[PDB]
Design an enzyme around this catalytic site. Sequence first.
Site, PDB file in Angstrom:
ATOM      1  N   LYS A 105     -57.177  57.971  35.787  1.00  0.00           N
ATOM      2  CA  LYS A 105     -57.811  57.865  36.862  1.00  0.00           C
ATOM      3  C   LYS A 105     -57.401  57.038  38.002  1.00  0.00           C
ATOM      4  O   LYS A 105     -56.728  56.119  37.743  1.00  0.00           O
ATOM      5  CB  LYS A 105     -59.447  57.728  36.805  1.00  0.00           C
ATOM      6  CG  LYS A 105     -59.997  58.878  35.473  1.00  0.00           C
ATOM      7  CD  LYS A 105     -61.319  58.677  35.521  1.00  0.00           C
ATOM      8  CE  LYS A 105     -61.913  59.676  34.804  1.00  0.00           C
ATOM      9  NZ  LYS A 105     -63.575  59.747  34.675  1.00  0.00           N
ATOM     10  N   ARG A 115     -60.215  61.506  22.557  1.00  0.00           N
ATOM     11  CA  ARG A 115     -61.523  61.102  23.010  1.00  0.00           C
ATOM     12  C   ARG A 115     -62.254  60.022  22.146  1.00  0.00           C
ATOM     13  O   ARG A 115     -62.938  59.297  22.856  1.00  0.00           O
ATOM     14  CB  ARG A 115     -62.303  62.392  22.702  1.00  0.00           C
ATOM     15  CG  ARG A 115     -61.928  63.624  23.761  1.00  0.00           C
ATOM     16  CD  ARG A 115     -62.449  63.524  25.056  1.00  0.00           C
ATOM     17  NE  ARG A 115     -64.113  63.904  24.857  1.00  0.00           N
ATOM     18  CZ  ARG A 115     -64.626  64.028  25.964  1.00  0.00           C
ATOM     19  NH1 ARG A 115     -64.245  63.708  27.191  1.00  0.00           N
ATOM     20  NH2 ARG A 115     -65.862  64.265  25.823  1.00  0.00           N
ATOM     21  N   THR A 148     -68.581  57.840  27.468  1.00  0.00           N
ATOM     22  CA  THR A 148     -68.410  57.978  29.003  1.00  0.00           C
ATOM     23  C   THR A 148     -68.924  56.758  29.747  1.00  0.00           C
ATOM     24  O   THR A 148     -68.352  56.096  30.677  1.00  0.00           O
ATOM     25  CB  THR A 148     -69.273  58.923  29.598  1.00  0.00           C
ATOM     26  OG1 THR A 148     -69.092  60.172  28.766  1.00  0.00           O
ATOM     27  CG2 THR A 148     -69.478  59.224  31.052  1.00  0.00           C
ATOM     28  N   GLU A 178     -56.887  72.670  31.086  1.00  0.00           N
ATOM     29  CA  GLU A 178     -56.526  71.665  31.988  1.00  0.00           C
ATOM     30  C   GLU A 178     -54.953  71.537  32.052  1.00  0.00           C
ATOM     31  O   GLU A 178     -54.514  71.112  33.000  1.00  0.00           O
ATOM     32  CB  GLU A 178     -57.225  70.274  31.355  1.00  0.00           C
ATOM     33  CG  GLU A 178     -58.850  70.483  31.666  1.00  0.00           C
ATOM     34  CD  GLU A 178     -59.442  69.317  30.830  1.00  0.00           C
ATOM     35  OE1 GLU A 178     -58.926  68.506  30.401  1.00  0.00           O
ATOM     36  OE2 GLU A 178     -60.851  69.367  30.999  1.00  0.00           O
TER      37      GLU A 178
HETATM   38  N1  LIG Z   1     -74.390  59.266  35.452  1.00  0.00           N
HETATM   39  C1  LIG Z   1     -73.174  59.133  35.852  1.00  0.00           C
HETATM   40  N2  LIG Z   1     -72.760  58.015  36.896  1.00  0.00           N
HETATM   41  C2  LIG Z   1     -71.591  57.906  37.228  1.00  0.00           C
HETATM   42  N3  LIG Z   1     -70.448  58.615  36.938  1.00  0.00           N
HETATM   43  C3  LIG Z   1     -70.554  59.625  36.023  1.00  0.00           C
HETATM   44  C4  LIG Z   1     -71.894  59.785  35.521  1.00  0.00           C
HETATM   45  N4  LIG Z   1     -71.773  61.008  34.613  1.00  0.00           N
HETATM   46  C5  LIG Z   1     -70.620  61.276  34.687  1.00  0.00           C
HETATM   47  N5  LIG Z   1     -69.661  60.456  35.316  1.00  0.00           N
HETATM   48  C6  LIG Z   1     -68.281  60.323  35.716  1.00  0.00           C
HETATM   49  O1  LIG Z   1     -68.037  61.881  35.667  1.00  0.00           O
HETATM   50  C7  LIG Z   1     -66.829  61.981  34.635  1.00  0.00           C
HETATM   51  C8  LIG Z   1     -66.840  63.388  33.983  1.00  0.00           C
HETATM   52  O2  LIG Z   1     -68.188  63.279  33.288  1.00  0.00           O
HETATM   53  P1  LIG Z   1     -68.211  64.011  31.866  1.00  0.00           P
HETATM   54  O3  LIG Z   1     -67.008  64.946  31.661  1.00  0.00           O
HETATM   55  O4  LIG Z   1     -69.512  63.901  31.308  1.00  0.00           O
HETATM   56  O5  LIG Z   1     -67.436  62.590  31.067  1.00  0.00           O
HETATM   57  P2  LIG Z   1     -66.385  62.277  30.024  1.00  0.00           P
HETATM   58  O6  LIG Z   1     -65.266  62.070  31.083  1.00  0.00           O
HETATM   59  O7  LIG Z   1     -66.686  60.953  29.037  1.00  0.00           O
HETATM   60  O8  LIG Z   1     -65.947  63.450  29.331  1.00  0.00           O
HETATM   61  C9  LIG Z   1     -67.056  60.678  33.710  1.00  0.00           C
HETATM   62  O9  LIG Z   1     -65.818  60.483  33.028  1.00  0.00           O
HETATM   63  C10 LIG Z   1     -67.462  59.632  34.748  1.00  0.00           C
HETATM   64  O10 LIG Z   1     -66.535  58.937  35.309  1.00  0.00           O
HETATM   65 MG   LIG Z   2     -65.589  65.692  30.276  1.00  0.00          MG
END
Ligand SMILES: Nc1ncnc2c1ncn2[C@@H]1O[C@H](COP(=O)(O)OP(=O)(O)O)[C@@H](O)[C@H]1O
Ligand SMILES: [Mg+2]
Lengths: 149, 149, 149
Positions: free
Chosen positions: B10, B85, B91, B126
């Site tokens: 990112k 992962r 997250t 993706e």
């Molecule tokens: N409650 C939150 N507050 C801030 N950023 C969030 C939140 N939930 C998710 N994100 C952001 O959105 C991205 C995508 O969410 P998700 O797919 O649930 O997580 P991951 O990347 O762990 O699979 C996360 O990696 C994170 O950067």
């Molecule tokens: Mg995700």
Amino acid sequence: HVEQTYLMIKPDGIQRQVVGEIISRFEKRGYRIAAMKLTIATPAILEEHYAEHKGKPFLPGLIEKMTGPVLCMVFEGVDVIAQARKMMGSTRPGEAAPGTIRADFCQQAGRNLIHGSDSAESAKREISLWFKPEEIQSYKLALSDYIFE
Amino acid sequence: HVEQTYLMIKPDGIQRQVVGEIISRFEKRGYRIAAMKLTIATPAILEEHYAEHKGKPFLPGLIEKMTGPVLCMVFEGVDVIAQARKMMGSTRPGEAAPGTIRADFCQQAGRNLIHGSDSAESAKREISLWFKPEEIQSYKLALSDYIFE
Amino acid sequence: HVEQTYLMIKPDGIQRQVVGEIISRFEKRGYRIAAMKLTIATPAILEEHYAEHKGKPFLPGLIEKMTGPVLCMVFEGVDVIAQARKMMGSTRPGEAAPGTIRADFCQQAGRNLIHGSDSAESAKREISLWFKPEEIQSYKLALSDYIFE
Ligand SMILES: Nc1ncnc2c1ncn2[C@@H]1O[C@H](COP(=O)(O)OP(=O)(O)O)[C@@H](O)[C@H]1O
Ligand SMILES: [Mg+2]
Ligand SMILES: Nc1ncnc2c1ncn2[C@@H]1O[C@H](COP(=O)(O)OP(=O)(O)O)[C@@H](O)[C@H]1O
Ligand SMILES: Nc1ncnc2c1ncn2[C@@H]1O[C@H](COP(=O)(O)OP(=O)(O)O)[C@@H](O)[C@H]1O
Ligand SMILES: [Mg+2]
Ligand SMILES: [Mg+2]
């Protein structure tokens, strides 16, 4: 919303010459160095630091082991009091999780490299014990936009 | 049998200049780089990437924080989707296990350095979103006999 | 009170040229190198090493994968048998905890980099199998006062 914690590299961290490695672990998360000072811990200051353990049988040997050079530090970050404790790992290195400071560097509780405040109350008290206010520096990290939400 | 996962550094990983360290963590396990591309993510592609999060309160801020340089990557290995992962960690960096990327580098969910596919179906989707098939490179690692059973 | 454990870098650790990284992980905790020898493992000694797996299905292939250069090691420290096992991680790298050797370097159980004794009895047996008593070196670490209680 950030907080500040008191971290102290104990004499074994100084003598094993891993100060820079310890600091790098906290810098790697974007924690800000707000204060840093090398001193030599004395029994009188260590008695106040470890006041909760007063009267106990294991305190005298703890004070002896801590009588030495230490690096007093204050780090700032989100949830940094609890996070720094997590990064240090369990008091007993053999119970500490892989990837923590104590698991990666140490063998026994009496030589476990580093101290970190256990709560907001202890952080306030410990920072006041080991630092004068002028030694706490206020500045902003230029990478803030990429560290914080 | 190996599989392939989509991993994306990112904008905070680019801007904090930890790209090489991230790549090294995956190379260290003998995971093979099958594709790699620096681009600048735009809202339209990010909307498709994060289509599962449509409507969620954090999505507009997520798209904003992700509008910036990214490193698109495909890594190949045994069970690499789930394993990458696990290496990334939770997250929330504060909940992630010591030794994971997010715990070692980050503080908050909104700046957590790296994306990885969460399943076989999402990895296929993706990889196809961010790479054309001609950009996926097939070769064999010279150390394969010492990495795989 | 310290003990000694038998650690062996398998042929994949030699061939992937991570011997120094492996040794550094154990030195980092103040574990003492008590013995060290590069040899080429033979089926005869490997049959005795892995006698507990006699008759099992994977034994002949395990012996084959292990017929190659290995680094025999003895490390000394507090609880070092159990602690080295914790640092190595689970047999299957995909189940090993982040921050362990197997999780950080490997993918599959048949190529999981390192062997370590699993108990006090096995450590005594394995050290005696791979080393003569004259090859075990006794000296004191100069940092002992800062490693041990
Ligand atoms: N409650 C939150 N507050 C801030 N950023 C969030 C939140 N939930 C998710 N994100 C952001 O959105 C991205 C995508 O969410 P998700 O797919 O649930 O997580 P991951 O990347 O762990 O699979 C996360 O990696 C994170 O950067
Ligand atoms: Mg995700
Ligand atoms: N049973 C023990 N044996 C040796 N040293 C100990 C023991 N308990 C505590 N200590 C030492 O005293 C320090 C402070 O004690 P405590 O606050 O309980 O642990 P921590 O520093 O992990 O918060 C420890 O970090 C450790 O160096
Ligand atoms: N199911 C398996 N598949 C492939 N290799 C295996 C399997 N089980 C064990 N092995 C190999 O045999 C070695 C010895 O087995 P074992 O003593 O059970 O594991 P460990 O080395 O973790 O103590 C392992 O380190 C691994 O290389
Ligand atoms: Mg305490
Ligand atoms: Mg075994």
